[PDB]
Paper text:
The di-iron catalytic ferroxidase center of [name] (sites A and B) has a nearby third iron site (site C) in an arrangement typically observed in prokaryotic ferritins. Here we demonstrate that Glu-44, a site C ligand, and Glu-130, a residue that bridges iron bound at sites B and C, limit the rate of post-oxidation reorganization of iron coordination and the rate at which Fe3+ exits the ferroxidase center for storage within the mineral core.
Glu-130, a ligand that can coordinate iron at both site B and site C, was substituted with the non-coordinating residue alanine. As seen in the E44Q Fe (45 min) structure (data not shown), Asn-97 is coordinated to Fe-B in the [name] Fe (o.n.) structure. In addition to these sites, up to two iron ions with occupancies of 40–55% were found beyond site C toward the mineral core, as seen in wild type [name]. Substitution of the site B/C coordinating residue Glu-130 with alanine, a non-coordinating residue, led to a striking 10-fold increase in mineralization activity; this is unusual in that active site mutations rarely enhance activity.
Residue numbers in the entry:
A (entry chain H), B (entry chain C), C (entry chain A), E (entry chain F): 2 to 158
D (entry chain B): 2 to 159
F (entry chain E): 1 to 158
Write the structure that this text describes.
Amino acid sequence: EELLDLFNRQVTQEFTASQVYLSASIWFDQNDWEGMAAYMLAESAEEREHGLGFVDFANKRNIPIELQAVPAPVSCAEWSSPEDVWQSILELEQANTRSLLNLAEAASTCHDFAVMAFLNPFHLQQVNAEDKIGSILAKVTDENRTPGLLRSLDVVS
Amino acid sequence: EELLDLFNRQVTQEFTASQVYLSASIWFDQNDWEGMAAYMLAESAEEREHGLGFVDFANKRNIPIELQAVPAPVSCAEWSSPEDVWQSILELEQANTRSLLNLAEAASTCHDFAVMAFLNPFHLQQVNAEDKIGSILAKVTDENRTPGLLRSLDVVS
Amino acid sequence: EELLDLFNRQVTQEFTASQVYLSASIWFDQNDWEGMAAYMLAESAEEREHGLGFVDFANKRNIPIELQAVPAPVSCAEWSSPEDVWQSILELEQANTRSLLNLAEAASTCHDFAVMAFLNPFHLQQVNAEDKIGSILAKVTDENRTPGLLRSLDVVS
Amino acid sequence: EELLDLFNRQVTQEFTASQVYLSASIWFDQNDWEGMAAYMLAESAEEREHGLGFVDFANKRNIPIELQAVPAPVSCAEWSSPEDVWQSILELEQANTRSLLNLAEAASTCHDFAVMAFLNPFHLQQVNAEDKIGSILAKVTDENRTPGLLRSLDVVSF
Amino acid sequence: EELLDLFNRQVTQEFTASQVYLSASIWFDQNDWEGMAAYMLAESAEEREHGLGFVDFANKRNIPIELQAVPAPVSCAEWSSPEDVWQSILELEQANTRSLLNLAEAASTCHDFAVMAFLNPFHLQQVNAEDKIGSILAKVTDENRTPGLLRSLDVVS
Amino acid sequence: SEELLDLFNRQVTQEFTASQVYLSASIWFDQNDWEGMAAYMLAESAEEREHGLGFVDFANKRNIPIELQAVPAPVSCAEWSSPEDVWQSILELEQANTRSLLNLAEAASTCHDFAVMAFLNPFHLQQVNAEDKIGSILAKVTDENRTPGLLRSLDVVS
Ligand SMILES: [Fe+3]
Ligand SMILES: [Fe+3]
Ligand SMILES: [Fe+3]
Ligand SMILES: [Fe+3]
Ligand SMILES: [Fe+3]
Ligand SMILES: [Fe+3]
Ligand SMILES: [Fe+3]
Ligand SMILES: [Fe+3]
Ligand SMILES: [Fe+3]
Ligand SMILES: [Fe+3]
Ligand SMILES: [Fe+3]
Ligand SMILES: [Fe+3]
Ligand SMILES: [Fe+3]
Ligand SMILES: [Fe+3]
Ligand SMILES: [Fe+3]
Ligand SMILES: [Fe+3]
Ligand SMILES: [Fe+3]
Ligand SMILES: [Fe+3]
Ligand SMILES: [Fe+3]
Ligand SMILES: [Fe+3]
Ligand SMILES: [Fe+3]
Ligand SMILES: [Fe+3]
Ligand SMILES: [Fe+3]
Ligand SMILES: [Fe+3]
Ligand SMILES: [Fe+3]
Ligand SMILES: [Fe+3]
Ligand SMILES: [Fe+3]
């Protein structure tokens, strides 16, 4: 019952992303990027709400949910500049997107029209999230070419 | 530094309790106790906010946080009735209280007045939380003596 | 009483900090850093308000206060750029913190519960104050790596 | 004066009632009947207000008031269900009614028209108070026949 | 244990003070000091509210409370002037302060952080209460040096 | 101008000195339970500090280098034992704030420093107001304090 397992794992993936955003928030705060830290913190809350959405839909559709361990974030070990963090967040969102497309591909195989309809807005959110992060990362990578300049973006924007 | 250690453990414990309250709402939902499930769901969010509060203080005080795995909730698999769930949630809160007091003990021994001040409203919150859950459990245990009657409590949320 | 002595020293320490913030405001103003000047000026009034809070408590609790001289700020003479100012201010705040922690320890030993309670919000204020000065100093030190760029933090504030 | 004496005893009886209501609040609360607890709590403040009213009238009328001890409520030692509590509260109000009629009898005897006029709203309050408490007791006694049912109306109601 | 006892005594002391304040309102009213009487009456209600706050906390923390007798006030038999009343009220509050501090000592000894946190605002209120009473008494004692002058305090504040 | 810069610096010192003397006075009044008088001195302390900040602000704009001096420990408190003594000391403080403004203005006139003279003018008028008001309070205090308790009644009302 691959579909029920993938749905279950999607919840884990959402909560996993929430923790990694939190991890990014903490690294930014510890290094005095309060603007970038606030953005990561909001995204952490948003990834948790996506998870809660999946759980609620599962409850309604009698998809048994069993909550799994939420793994320790580990990219924070290696981050040493804002660019490192944003790049890890971009990889996280790309993985998020692949996991949703797998889910929707299993639903399609099983003719599970309800699940596919449920997933639609999420596919469009991922498009927007990858673009947004991609854009932030491009800015960060450009600005960090001059010492101190990126520190101006955080504060202003 | 056992203080740093206990502070990290507290963050973990708050997120752990968040997940346990989510598993409770899941079980309540799946068994058609929507009122009780709404309540657990809001407590889940609240525990997460307590975790965030600790993280924020730790950042400001240069207590380095490293996010740990959030363990899977274990007790659901054994719950059979609402009484079982409210009992596990009472134990959870009793544990929550214990670890706040341990943390506070270690702060005291260190003369860390800032940490003690920070924890005061959580100590008072814990008193309230254990009271409220104790009270709910007593009602549940009294009302469940008549078949069907507890379902009536549940349509009071 | 050493408690009495320390309580009186704390008043002087708050007024001393007010003067030193004022000295910084002056140095910033004379050097055309109006945004940083305004910020230091507001911190000078706040420090004076803390002094006054201690004085008022002392009157109420029969701690005799005798006001001491407020020494001339000395660090201005050596400041050459905004980094030097902000680093002196961070030191000032670290010393404000230590003096409050010593007062609290003296209060603890005498079982002076009222003094300990009165001090709690100042312990938490200090945590915030050090985090905030720490974070400005980090930005200032990063942005001053490019000529003129820090002058852009000041105006955009 | 028997009147001065009864007037002072009236004050004591009110403050005693206030304490007994408070002990009922505490038993309810400790036993997780928060609605019944809130009711008793509000009744304790009301009884205190009746005592203060008597005190104020006494001062105006030059009846010297000497505040007496308010004894420890002791029935809580033996309460074990809400029914026991409300039974004790009914007895309490029947006693409040009796000390009021004693005071009024003595006032009538002495032709103290002012005192009797002062007492009239209290005589009507007691009527209402005894009626309300008796009705709550009848409800509690009927509901407690089915396990759990009483609890379900502490919550919904009070 | 010492904590449950002291906690019960504290409720007793608050209700006793409530009666003592009532007793003073009585004495003032009987002697045509309506202003001072109204003030004592408000204080009587306020002490009663403190007692109820302790009771509520004890309920929540499972500190069994059993209400003790409220003794007959007895200072009233000896009061001859406003000054004697206000002197008894000062001693009353100094005794209120004493017992709070003992309760706090005992809580500290047991590491009862919740009780200590609950007590902190009462410690600060006692400081204010003793100040205010000390100050009223100074005024009464000064003003009563000229016949009839104290009747002025009363009809104004 | 050298004596003009020095006097302008001393003027800053004088305002903050006065601010601390007024605070000393608030503390003495509070400790002796004159709350009304205490609140008035505290308000004055803040206002004196504001005047100082106004001088600092003008100095900065005019490029008069300000170096902040020690603010001395107030010492009149040691001597005060009634409200009269506190108010007299405050009158003499405002009389010295006045002399010191007039000195400054004298140096500026000499130097033809028109902007400084313009800047001082409202402070000259304020000092008139301040010496008049302290004078009036001190006369009231000294009159009232001839009857025991009387002064106390008017801290409390006014
Ligand atoms: Fe978003
Ligand atoms: Fe997501
Ligand atoms: Fe997003
Ligand atoms: Fe986003
Ligand atoms: Fe928690
Ligand atoms: Fe909790
Ligand atoms: Fe909760
Ligand atoms: Fe809550
Ligand atoms: Fe601030
Ligand atoms: Fe600040
Ligand atoms: Fe400070
Ligand atoms: Fe600050
Ligand atoms: Fe009633
Ligand atoms: Fe009623
Ligand atoms: Fe009623
Ligand atoms: Fe009554
Ligand atoms: Fe009654
Ligand atoms: Fe009070
Ligand atoms: Fe009060
Ligand atoms: Fe008061
Ligand atoms: Fe009290
Ligand atoms: Fe009191
Ligand atoms: Fe003035
Ligand atoms: Fe001035
Ligand atoms: Fe002046
Ligand atoms: Fe003035
Ligand atoms: Fe003025």
